[PDB]
């Protein structure tokens, strides 16, 4: 068991020794009497090495190689040539030939050295060709298993295209437009505002825990119990609607929070009654070039313990929400970070300009998710 | 603006004519007086391809080629010569030159081609050696952003999995066992009690398998439970009606083949309600389906029919996963057959579980109850 050869020389006696002696060493030998059945050897199953004369009846040396190079089958080729011809030595290595010998030579292993030398710089090329193809092909089935994934990320992610609604949705005056940039398809970021009989003004935005498929699990049953709800009532508190999510969230499904930010505004007394249950960065208020958070305190805890602070509207106006979204252009710091945002938010153009400033600057995917809900009145 | 060159010949009146030729053809031609400073202009930069005589001051030819090669920089070496000697080409051949010329070769043009054979059949081992090379790069660089996107749907994974309930929750057996098509799957399977005296449970295969498939498992587990948060206690059905107005109410226009159903444990009888494979129960070694027959149709349309449980029972429903087969018919009485030969429950699934762990076709769910 080893590395195959195919000796082709003339000479029966000479060919007969070159053969017990590779042969012992654990060499195939394959024999040849005549330089053209040993090119039909060949061509039947490919050898490794083919050593032979030049001087031979019917086909000779030089040409038994000339074919053996256009058969595509670049196999190592040794010439234990008996001839001291020169002319028939500078061609056999024009063609390509691994080690030119002399003959009679008298250390039967000299070819030993010069046999494994060629099968060595031929064995590279082989598994060269073979990583090539067994790395082009284990990668063309691996993104066809991918592929389906990156398919059913885009089938997930539509779906939720269509569950927030649109910008920007003026109404009496109120331009309740947003904008999310998800990190990985669909986000755990969600942001919803819906009416209510036309007296009665929601809205809110929330943060599942982190991002992802696991995520977006909790987006979904945010927008059809906020929604189902109208169905059902035939009409109190912002801070009863966080309540129902945590008995709900809170009932074996899934075991995930959300910090949310709701609210409903009355548009005959422009007065807002907010609730908050997560301590993600309060909703900072625009008016007249100003800037400044609001005073109040998840659905994860069996204790609602929700408040809710109600307050009057000037009639200039622009409350701005934010999720998980820091440093998504300072950081390095909590604190600053925790007024950071209002004196940037104050700075930019109430809501677009600034925030479109950041959105096509850094497209890079934000650890967690980033998402921003912005009113205007004015 | 092509190759080049690094012709190294004595005679400079021989490497003269030699040089305005090749660099006629926009080849860069760097000369070499001297065997020695040309083994030097080969280490600075990397020369192309190198033409060289033999018998010249300080490095001749012989020394000039063996370690060029010893450097592993194996590039072009044409030997073009005047000696004669074959012990002389022998040699420079074993070192692996590309084509002996002779001189005085009268025709400049033979060389050209000479040239060419090697540069070209070595422009194309640098490109398999940058094309493995960008395969190799390309390929791992993928791979990170292959198992990236995989621990996503993980996540997707280890959420659902804390849904479903425990088995086999033994009460008073609810034994289940979800083997999703690939991460997040559209099965669903749930059995909750209720104030000790009535136990309810059901199975649920949303439309197709995958993402948009996952999002209606969830909303089904909310509104089987809400209705306990709400509900101060009539028919099984009801509940399937209920799914309806929600899942009809632009929920993702998905659907689900249920097959829910409340069981008293006070008075031995189930109410079940089938709105996909019916229920297969096994007792003493035989089966046989119920009566019955979604949440896309604007009408209820759902019935219950009453039945009495033996001491012995062991209901079995089964989602979109099929197998004989190779005759809907035949797959629609074998599975109650395949049921009675099983151990109940834990003979035939356990089984024909580990034995093919490849994906089937849609997501495939099992929810076997027990009581013996």
């Known amino acids: 068991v080893s590395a ?50 030049l001087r031979m009846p019917q086909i000779d040396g030089l040409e038994l190689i000339r074919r053996i190079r256009q058969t595509a089958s670049e196999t190592p080729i040794i010439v234990l040539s008996g001839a001291g011809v020169m002319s028939d030595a500078v061609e056999a290595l024009r063609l390509g030939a691994a080690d030119y010998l002399i003959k009679p030579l008298e250390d039967l292993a000299v070819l030993e050295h010069s046999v494994r030398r060629a099968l060595d710089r031929a064995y590279l090329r082989v598994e060269n060709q073979r990583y090539r193809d067994k790395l082009e092909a284990a ?10 994934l990156q398919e059913d990320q885009n089938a997930g992610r539509q779906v939720q295209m269509n569950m927030l609604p649109v910008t920007p949705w003026s109404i009496e005056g109120l331009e309740f437009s947003h904008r999310i940039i998800p990190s990985l398809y669909l986000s755990g970021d969600f942001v919803d505002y819906f009416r209510v009989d036309e007296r009665r003004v929601a809205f809110y935005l929330a943060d599942v825990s982190g991002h992802g498929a696991s995520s977006a699990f909790v987006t979904v049953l945010l927008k059809f119990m906020t929604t189902r709800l109208l169905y059902e009532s035939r009409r109190f508190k912002p801070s009863e609607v966080l309540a129902h999510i945590n008995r709900g969230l809170i009932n074996t499904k899934l075991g995930k929070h959300v910090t949310m930010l709701g609210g409903v505004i009355d548009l005959e007394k422009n007065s807002l009654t907010y609730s908050i249950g997560g301590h993600l960065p309060l909703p900072v208020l625009f008016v007249e070039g100003q800037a400044g958070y609001l005073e109040g305190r998840v659905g994860l805890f069996d204790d609602a313990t929700y408040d809710d602070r109600v307050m009057e509207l000037p009639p200039s106006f622009s409350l701005s929400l934010f999720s998980d979204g820091i440093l998504d252009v300072g950081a390095t710091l909590k604190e600053k970070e925790a007024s950071l945002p209002e004196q940037v938010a104050a700075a930019g153009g109430t809501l677009d300009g600034l925030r479109q400033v950041f959105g096509l600057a850094n497209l890079a995917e934000m650890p967690d998710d980033i998402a921003l809900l912005v009113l205007s009145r004015n």
Do not use: M
């Open 4 to 53: 195959t050869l195919l000796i082709i020389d003339d000479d029966e006696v000479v060919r007969e020794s070159l053969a017990a002696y590779l042969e012992d060493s654990n060499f195939k030998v394959l024999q040849a009497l005549n330089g053209l059945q040993g090119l039909q050897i060949f061509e039947s199953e490919q050898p490794d090495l083919v050593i032979c004369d």
């Open 139 to 148: 990668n063309r089935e691996l993104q066809a298993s991918l592929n389906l």
